């Protein structure tokens, strides 16, 4: 029943990485740098 310690630790590491990746998909206030 439940996660094994390896399963839970791997899920936590993958969760941290995925959350940073999703945070990095955000746009800075100037990202659409439109040329004239």
């Amino acid at each position: 029943s439940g996660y094994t310690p390896d399963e839970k630790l791997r899920l936590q590491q993958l969760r941290e990485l995925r959350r940073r990746w999703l945070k990095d998909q955000e746009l800075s206030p100037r990202e659409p740098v439109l040329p004239p």
Partner: protein, 69 residues
């Protein structure tokens, strides 16, 4: 909050469409203007009977000026 949208590169399709439109228009806008000018200022011939003793040229059996040319 604004997010980045992952897409395939649309630059090349857009450039191809722009080039095809440019070349088609480059040749076909002069053709349209010329056809309009010919139609307005040199209309079609009107049908007439062949006068006595007159033998027409082979292109005188058509009425549109472009077809005659």
């Amino acid at each position: 909050k604004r997010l980045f949208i992952i897409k395939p590169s649309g630059f090349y399709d857009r450039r191809f469409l722009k080039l095809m439109r440019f070349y088609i228009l480059l040749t076909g806008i002069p053709v349209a203007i010329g056809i309009t000018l010919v139609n307005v200022f040199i209309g079609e011939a009107e049908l007439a009977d062949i006068p006595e003793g007159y033998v027409p040229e082979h292109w005188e059996y058509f009425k549109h000026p472009i077809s005659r040319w």
